[PDB]
């Protein structure tokens, strides 16, 4: 039988309340992949291309609970885990791959770091911009996008879908080389 | 099993030619971050659902490496981009062109002959004109001068971006963004 | 230049770091007897068809020197050896390791992140750890204690031998000759 070779994890929160918030951009990418998600453990899980795509149902800062058991079961190394998430440290229109390093305060990234015991999983950072002050971060990410931002969101979603498949096929450095410098604004 | 596009770099194979002007197209493909290996009469890399070619045919016979793949995969000419040195543009200029004449470029002519159409796209990378117009073959088979190397570096970084632009967005948006640049 | 391998010594540049525990990798590279010169953000030497590097990046940034070089020369990660001090082994231990976690070593993390893989080789030179982990930065940026220095000499000699071994035979054969040593005995 086959054995799953990679995890692609979309960050978000469960339920209709949160489906259109900036903090669900990772779920919005996973829903653009043409996949068949089904319930498994504490997530919605799709298989494609010999690995797993998941939208955890844990809430955003508890996704590590859903990712780490799957990684351990399948012996999937951090470089074959890609966490797709919104990023306040980049403007909307910018996308960046990153292997490891800081979480920049993103508590979903931190959840997965604690659960795995390593920071060195891969990330696809989807810029959403930042409020005028950092003390407004929770409110900013749990808001929807402004209507005027929607056309850019659509371009980013499309780019991100391409990026995900790039990474699955090629790993991080090649994909970073062609996607990091895009300005979708 | 389905390939959506071909990007073809012009050049001659071998270390002897790797730094020559007529290898500008190879040099751009070598900046894209891909993994090339031998495949037919070419070094080929796969990325983004298409193929990138550095032919092994020599410059003037590149069509022979392009056409089997275009035929097999049913790639229309508008999804083939030929990246090549252009003596009719100065060093520092880059221009997208859809279709049209080969303008004496024997590699471009080889591709037109092999595909049976001019409709394919080109990324023309200016290299300037030799002083003596009878020394054009020798000019393209020489290295860039020391003092041109900084401009070459800018044009390679730009052309790298331009190729990816074309892959994602097609030619009009990218001609919009690049054709006006002057990196000299 | 076709380059068959990269051997990287972890350290920081400058006199004030030269004798610190975190400079064991530089100390091994200086034991090789080679002629290093500046090249990019590194001191570089050539021998046996490959490259030997003391990056000038600082310890936690060495991936920025290593990864572009490896990509330029198409060097697979298993032909990259990183020589470094290791708090998770006692002084006197010398262990080759393929892949695995960085164990918190921020220089090994730099390389893993920049390469986008764990798959490079390491020559782990034990230095022990402080009794409280909250003074780890001071511990690594300290010289060895007086009584430690004779041990360090045995470890540097063995590590020079081990680098030459690995250049020729790579990791398993050389692990078979070095990994059971305890030079504190
Ligand atoms: N770089 C970031 N990208 C996305 N979400 C973030 C980032 N930094 C902070 N957050 C979220 O913003 C909220 C405010 O976090 P804090 O800044 O620690 O007050 C929390 O829900 C974080 O998970
Ligand atoms: N296993 C290790 N070997 C060597 N240096 C380490 C190791 N773990 C942590 N360090 C360094 O120790 C310092 C303290 O690390 P930490 O306690 O994580 O931030 C930093 O400079 C780390 O890079």
Numbering used by the authors:
A (entry chain B): -3 to 181
B (entry chain C): -2 to 181
C (entry chain A): -2 to 182
Reported in the publication:
To elucidate the binding mode of the peptidyl-A76 moiety of the substrate, we first determined the structure of TtPth in a complex with AMP by X-ray crystallography. The asymmetric unit of the crystal contains two TtPth⋅AMP complexes (A and B chains) and one AMP-unbound TtPth (C chain). The structures of the two TtPth⋅AMP complexes are quite similar (root mean square deviation for equivalent Cα atoms is 0.38 Å). The structure of TtPth⋅AMP revealed that AMP is bound to an acidic pocket at the bottom of the active site cleft (A−C). In this pocket, TtPth interacts with AMP via 9 amino acid residues (His19, Asp82, Glu83, Met84, Ala100, Gly101, Asn102, Arg103, and Ala134). Furthermore, the N6 atom of adenine forms hydrogen bonds with the side chain carboxyl oxygen of Glu83 and the main chain carbonyl oxygen of Ala100, and the N1 atom of adenine forms a hydrogen bond with the main chain amide nitrogen of Met84. In addition, the hydroxyl O2′ atom of the ribose hydrogen bonds with the main chain amide nitrogen of Arg103. No interaction was observed with the phosphate moiety of AMP. These results indicate that TtPth interacts primarily with the adenine and ribose moieties of AMP, while the phosphate moiety is minimally engaged by TtPth. Likewise, the distances between the gate loop (Asn102) and the lid loop (Val137) in TtPth⋅AMP and apo TtPth are 10.39 Å and 11.03 Å, respectively. These results indicate that AMP binding does not change the structure appreciably. In this research, the structure of the TtPth⋅AMP complex revealed that the adenine ring of the A76-mimicking AMP binds to the acidic pocket in the active site cleft.
